[PDB]
Design a protein around this ligand. Structure first.
Ligand SMILES: *[C@@H]1O[C@H](CO)[C@@H](O[C@@H]2O[C@H](CO)[C@@H](O[C@@H]3O[C@H](CO)[C@@H](O)[C@H](O)[C@@H]3O)[C@H](O)[C@H]2NC(C)=O)[C@H](O)[C@H]1NC(C)=O
Ligand SMILES: *[C@@H]1O[C@H](CO)[C@@H](O[C@@H]2O[C@H](CO)[C@@H](O[C@@H]3O[C@H](CO)[C@@H](O)[C@H](O)[C@@H]3O)[C@H](O)[C@H]2NC(C)=O)[C@H](O)[C@H]1NC(C)=O
Ligand SMILES: *[C@@H]1O[C@H](CO)[C@@H](O[C@@H]2O[C@H](CO)[C@@H](O)[C@H](O)[C@H]2NC(C)=O)[C@H](O)[C@H]1NC(C)=O
Ligand SMILES: CCCCCCCC/C=C\CCCCCCCC(=O)O
Ligand SMILES: *[C@@H]1O[C@H](CO)[C@@H](O)[C@H](O)[C@H]1NC(C)=O
Length: 153
């Protein structure tokens, strides 16, 4: 489903700096790729860094990424594979998570991505994410988790 982005949502400088875990998406992409870790460093208003993930074909792999930021949108570019390369629009930004949405070749009808500061986000963070999704006309129940990451005994 296409979101209804906030009209005056600002993307503050260096808000994306550091390590993030991509743990929840719509549609569910985690049969295709899992254990996604992002690390971003600031370069002016833009970002550069690395994404590591587990590929069914390649096992644990690493890629260099660039984020080119313009207002509430950014261009995501990966160095050695381009199925996720797209413009992405920020839908929500918080100290504990951020959400954006784009239409990469891997999911051309739309892909919502939720990135967390925590590998296994606590209940209170997920509840905030649920509320943020509703605020941009999305629904958490239509998202899928990375079940390959052990967040429960
Ligand atoms: C899930 O993703 C995490 C994050 O990438 C993986 O943890 C990382 O695993 C690699 C390989 O075991 C570690 O690399 C090692 O780093 C040391 C220091 O740089 C180096 O000397 C070794 O030769 C090796 O390159 C990496 O440190 C480690 N990171 C963390 C934070 O633990 C994990 O393996 C992935 N698991 C699955 C099942 O995909
Ligand atoms: C896309 O970006 C990734 C991540 O930066 C690149 O992976 C890197 O590839 C180089 C080879 O070009 C690897 O160098 C290797 O280092 C190991 C020690 O770790 C050593 O055995 C050799 O000297 C070898 O040359 C480097 O480790 C590797 N980095 C990571 C984090 O995996 C990849 O090459 C880039 N691809 C393209 C097409 O630009
Ligand atoms: C994705 O993971 C979250 C977190 O584990 C799930 O939300 C929890 O679901 C369990 C039962 O599945 C409930 O007991 C918790 O109360 C839920 N937490 C919150 C904050 O609502 C979510 O259901 C998972 N989604 C899918 C599709 O499996
Ligand atoms: C905002 C998007 C950031 C998340 C990107 C998800 C990371 C997934 C990375 C790589 C997925 C695998 C690439 C596609 C597989 C084909 C590669 C090949 O056959 O050589
Ligand atoms: C971003 O991409 C440019 C290519 O235009 C590259 O030279 C640079 O190393 C990347 N990272 C930055 C600018 O932090």
């Amino acid at each position: 489903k296409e979101p209804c982005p906030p009209e005056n949502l600002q993307l503050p400088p260096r808000a994306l700096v550091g390590k993030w875990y991509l743990r929840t998406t719509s549609p569910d992409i985690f049969k295709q790729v899992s254990n996604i870790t992002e690390f971003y460093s600031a370069h002016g208003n833009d970002y550069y860094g690395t994404v590591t993930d587990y590929s069914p074909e390649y096992g644990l792999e690493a890629h260099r990424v660039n984020l080119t930021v313009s207002g509430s949108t950014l261009k995501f570019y990966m160095n050695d594979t381009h199925d996720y390369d797209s413009e992405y629009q920020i839908l929500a930004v918080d100290k504990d998570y951020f959400i954006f949405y784009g239409h990469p070749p891997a999911a051309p009808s739309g892909l919502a991505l939720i990135h967390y500061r925590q590998s296994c986000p606590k209940e209170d963070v997920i509840k905030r994410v649920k509320k943020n999704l509703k605020n941009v006309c999305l629904d958490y129940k239509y998202f899928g988790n990375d079940t390959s990451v052990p967040c429960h005994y």
